[PDB]
């Protein structure tokens, strides 16, 4: 009741009944229902002094009675704003020491799991702080150890996937590895859980970063996956980042003049995009080439058609197809004496509803041909089919 | 984790034991029959060699009301080891006719008894098929085809019926 | 008396709580100990079962057995996770009672509840009447969320309420500073 009394008035009155619930559940060791309300108020932004003090006071008693997920989460909420990364690392090391003291040995029933997953989350947050500490190499090594542990734990039960993938995404963003950030963020979004979707603004910024990386990523040449994903619902309506959504739509469609105007206006929004403007123009050219190949069809092409459909001169089409073949978009072969660019298997695209009917009709024709051939074969050689 | 799901080989004895099991317990329609698929593994080609009956029970209701005896698996294991120590549990089979809802759920029960990933063997015991009535389904985790959370689901494997010297005769 | 029984222990997150020192989980394990010992003393021929009602859908830990070693090993390897889908657990327990090795032992069920019964009331009454029709005897030992569970526990017992058959006995003992198996020794058992 002592520290309970001290923390009772060190907050807002709206949070005071929560303190009463914490005190009531502490009386008869109902600490799981206490942790429910602890999570209830910890997620709320009102807990800025509470994250600083209530954790280190309350949970110091109940840290060895509750599932370690909530225990580590309560400390994580505290370290969402602090710039005490030295003492934050010391806090994480203390958490490791306590978990490797209780779960070290003397395991005698009482359920439990030795709570290795909490240790994995703690190490992931150590890597996160190291990234905040500009420990890029050390953070990378730590997350390598984390993925090694991910190989263990016999297909780990989610949760740790969220923190680990978020940590790798943050590392790739800080290292400006656009393709790695894109893939890791997509994996994290797929592995996201419905227990909490953190701050809507933070997830909006994450979607913004994902769009930036997709636009500035090398091994990405189809933005359909991002556009029709629930991650885009965060800025499916906002106008502050509507410019990049329009630019992505132009990228997919292949618009040139609209792309030029949008890139001119928004080149000053971030210097990161201004640095890689030429890469974005090459992305436009490759978009146009792929869409023209997929629309005009024809296993062959011509230099003039590519030049007209990509706005590049008839002398730079060759390098364009060089990049296209090297990046894996196509598997063709050039011919310059007579400009007759030859095209083979093309990068696959998501199939729409209309394409199903044509493929179904072609299937029907193929199956009818096969049936006719089989009927002829059976009829002709019935004397030996035994 | 072992990747051994490239090829599956079944001796005819496992399959005929499946048919005998189905015709023995008088299973009517909608009543699936399940047993264990004792064999040898740890190589690329998983090989099924011997089987036995299991007291699997399930009401045609909520998929979680499935019941299966835990002691029977180990009790059969001990006797079969006494008869032959070269045959180890490598999963389970059900008496067809096609994949059901609880297949993913019940497979996890055999995770501890098995050493590698448990093997599912569908047996067209009532013989509606035209080709081979057997197909393998190893439960593996891969990303969703709809761009959603990674799912631990079954994967079809090329199963070929092949006999040894003892059973070919 | 030859009496095949199954013990539906609860390992839900609410059952992790510690109103009974040390925890409701440990108290349930000790009650399972006492019930197994008492059934052994009454008649060693009786077989006991262990079914856990939490950890996603209920998982059978051991079939109808009379040996403490295997179930006790199972008790050490059942993590306290998930919620208590008591309807599915009761249905599974009914399914187990069909496969008694001794087909003469009468069906008995003792279920441990430490979480709200958030199940379909009509479906619950249907399950209770199905259990009564199969002459299945059910006992529920309530400690924990008594304010809610006792709304459906009495309904269960009034739906089973075997007059001449094995009568269902309800226990809703409020958490008290006495030993739990001492509380369950007299009222529900005898």
From Swiss-Prot, chain A:
Disulfide bonds: none annotated. Keywords: Proteasome. GO terms for molecular function: structural molecule activity. GO terms for biological process: proteasome assembly; proteasome-mediated ubiquitin-dependent protein catabolic process; ubiquitin-dependent protein catabolic process. It comes from the Eukaryota. Pfam families: PCI (PF01399), PSD13_N (PF22037), Rpn9_C (PF18261). InterPro entries: PCI_dom, PSD13_N, PSMD13, Rpn9_C, WH_DNA-bd_sf. The keyword Oxidoreductase does not apply. One of its GO terms (cellular component) is cytosol. PROSITE patterns: PCI (PS50250). Residues 180-348 form the PCI domain. Acts as a regulatory subunit of the 26S proteasome which is involved in the ATP-dependent degradation of ubiquitinated proteins. Present with 12400 molecules/cell in log phase SD medium. Belongs to the proteasome subunit S11 family. This is 26S proteasome regulatory subunit RPN9. It comes from Saccharomyces cerevisiae (strain ATCC 204508 / S288c).
Curated annotation (Swiss-Prot), chain B:
N-acetylated by NAT1. The modification N-acetylserine is found at residue 2. One of its GO terms (molecular function) is metallopeptidase activity. One of its GO terms (cellular component) is proteasome regulatory particle, lid subcomplex. Residues 8-143 form the MPN domain. Keywords: Acetylation, Phosphoprotein, Proteasome. Disulfide bonds: none annotated. GO terms for biological process: proteasome-mediated ubiquitin-dependent protein catabolic process; ubiquitin-dependent protein catabolic process. Present with 19800 molecules/cell in log phase SD medium. Belongs to the peptidase M67A family. Acts as a regulatory subunit of the 26S proteasome which is involved in the ATP-dependent degradation of ubiquitinated proteins. This is 26S proteasome regulatory subunit RPN8. It comes from Saccharomyces cerevisiae (strain ATCC 204508 / S288c). The gene is RPN8. The chain holds residues 1 to 169 of 338 of the full protein.
Swiss-Prot record, chain C:
GO terms for cellular component: cytosol; nucleus; proteasome complex; proteasome regulatory particle, base subcomplex. GO terms for molecular function: K48-linked polyubiquitin modification-dependent protein binding; polyubiquitin modification-dependent protein binding. GO terms for biological process: proteasome assembly; proteasome-mediated ubiquitin-dependent protein catabolic process; ubiquitin-dependent protein catabolic process. Keywords: Proteasome, Ubl conjugation. Disruption phenotype: Cells are viable. The 26S proteasome is composed of a core protease, known as the 20S proteasome, capped at one or both ends by the 19S regulatory complex (RC). The RC is composed of at least 18 different subunits in two subcomplexes, the base and the lid, which form the portions proximal and distal to the 20S proteolytic core, respectively. Present with 17200 molecules/cell in log phase SD medium. This is 26S proteasome regulatory subunit RPN10. It comes from Saccharomyces cerevisiae (strain ATCC 204508 / S288c). The lineage of its organism: Eukaryota, Fungi, Dikarya, Ascomycota, Saccharomycotina. The chain holds residues 2 to 191 of 268 of the full protein.
